[PDB]
Amino acid sequence: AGAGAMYDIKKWRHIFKLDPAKHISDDDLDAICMSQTDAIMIGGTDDVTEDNVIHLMSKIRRYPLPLVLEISNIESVMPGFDFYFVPTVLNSTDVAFHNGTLLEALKTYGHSIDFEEVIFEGYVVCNADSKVAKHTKANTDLTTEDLEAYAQMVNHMYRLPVMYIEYSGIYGDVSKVQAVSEHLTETQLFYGGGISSEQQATEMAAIADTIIVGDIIYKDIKKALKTVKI
Amino acid sequence: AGAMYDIKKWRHIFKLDPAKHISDDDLDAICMSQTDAIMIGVTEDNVIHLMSKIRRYPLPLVLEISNIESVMPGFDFYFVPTVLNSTDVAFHNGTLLEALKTYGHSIDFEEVIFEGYVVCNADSKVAKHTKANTDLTTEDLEAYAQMVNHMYRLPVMYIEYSGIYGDVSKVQAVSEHLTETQLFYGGGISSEQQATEMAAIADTIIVGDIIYKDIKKALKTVKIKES
């Protein structure tokens, strides 16, 4: 990620994350895209395809806010996004999710990538009962110490621009997010999982630099909208 | 302070395997050579002795930490490998996670240099040990070079051919994608000819085995051309 790209992204506090495998009505998408969120991120687990990413991105391009793709696989990578976020799932037991899939993507597209718009994210999946934990083969048996060690790894050795604490499916352990933040300095802390109110949004946004809100969008659009009130 | 501790200026490093034997005379010869640093790759007692001798000379002494048992004070820098083409997460960051849980409170990270390794010799011990994918085409290596330089943005990419001399066109292809990341090359350098050919591509060559096989040839490996 370039210095200008991180200057812009460091200002973001709230991102609405859309799963292209899910359907979202025009009314709901319009409410999301016209809201006070800082950016829309397309991301999913399995079932992220060229067709469904194309279909969703085409509807979102009708709006001016930043649109980013969290790359899930090679098939769905495509031009047109403002930034590309690439997870390396640090607690995955499978190298495909560390850099194996990335390697294949770089072989295919490396010739023409603008790496200043690519943000490599150190991702730690923390909820066992989630499609992302199952999909990424994550080891979720993690203690606060494990998380602090991953935070030191990301901030001091890899020095990645973003560490993403992912609790997809439930509201996370606030003390753990706090513990991780104490080790992050130049790396931004993104947190996602279970946020469905102004209060949960505010609580996690007081610790993380940027909160990611996703599932609530499909369950209660008005509750989703309250999450931008940080 | 000085060019001496600036890793970006180093062109040649003699790498010692503390499990191997080296005479005091041969060690002094290495230490008084124009190499830029000595790198040691828990046989702790030979290591403490080894360090005591090298410290009689004004040259950087660094430790490459291979396992959690390698942890140890007294070095100028601590180089930590991540084997990017390993098929086992322990060698990407699993072992590193355990080491940080144990020692992360006591480490000064400014002295730690993370090395993005690509192990290239199928018939080597490290490849077997790390379960490395060594079926690398030039395109595979170019993609790992982009990954290290642009995504992980590590300070060092280390191409390791272990006991054999590698493929110059592949090391060349790699070098073309590296800008801020320094290229270390190690593998079978046993002559001034080989040292010179690789040092014209890599930023720093690492010379190890020849030290134990023929000290005279090893000493000739410091004769390279200007960068």
Side-chain angles (χ1 to χ4, degrees), chain A residues 1-2 86 88-95 98-99 102-104 106-107 109-111 115 118-120 142-143 145-146 149-150 152-153 156-161, chain B residues 80 82-89 92-93 96-98 100-101 103-105 109-110 112-114 133 136-137 139-140 143-144 146-147 150-155:
Chain A
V86 180
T88 179
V89 183
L90 301 176
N91 62 323
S92 180
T93 59
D94 183 340
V95 169
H98 281 257
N99 69 9
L102 174 54
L103 183 72
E104 289 307 317
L106 295 184
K107 287 168 73 175
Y109 306 109
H111 59 89
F115 289 96
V118 177
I119 295 82
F120 201 27
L142 300 178
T143 58
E145 289 72 22
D146 280 320
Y150 275 123
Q152 292 189 302
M153 186 178 301
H156 307 316
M157 294 180 63
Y158 286 107
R159 305 196 162 92
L160 301 187
Chain B
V80 175
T82 177
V83 184
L84 297 176
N85 62 321
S86 172
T87 64
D88 182 341
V89 170
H92 282 248
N93 70 182
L96 175 61
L97 179 80
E98 293 309 308
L100 295 176
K101 286 170 60 164
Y103 301 106
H105 70 289
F109 291 94
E110 285 300 308
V112 177
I113 303 305
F114 208 14
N133 166 20
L136 308 167
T137 60
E139 290 73 24
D140 288 321
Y144 273 116
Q146 292 190 302
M147 195 188 286
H150 300 293
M151 286 182 76
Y152 288 81
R153 299 186 71 170
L154 304 185

Side-chain angles (χ1 to χ4, degrees), chain A residues 17 41 70 87-91 121-127 130 132 140 142-152 154 162-184 187-195 204 207-213:
Chain A
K17 185 170 188 179
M41 172 183 281
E70 188 168 71
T88 179
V89 183
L90 301 176
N91 62 323
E121 302 173 298
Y123 214 98
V124 181
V125 173
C126 304
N127 179 9
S130 57
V132 65
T140 59
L142 300 178
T143 58
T144 302
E145 289 72 22
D146 280 320
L147 297 171
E148 293 181 85
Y150 275 123
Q152 292 189 302
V154 179
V162 170
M163 182 171 186
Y164 193 136
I165 292 297
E166 174 65 290
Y167 265 95
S168 177
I170 198 177
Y171 188 69
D173 185 328
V174 178
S175 63
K176 280 179 181 179
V177 180
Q178 174 65 34
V180 167
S181 75
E182 291 180 37
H183 295 277
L184 305 181
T187 295
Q188 294 289 288
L189 171 56
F190 277 23
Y191 164 90
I195 291 171
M204 287 295 191
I207 301 168
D209 295 301
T210 306
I211 56 170
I212 314 304
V213 178

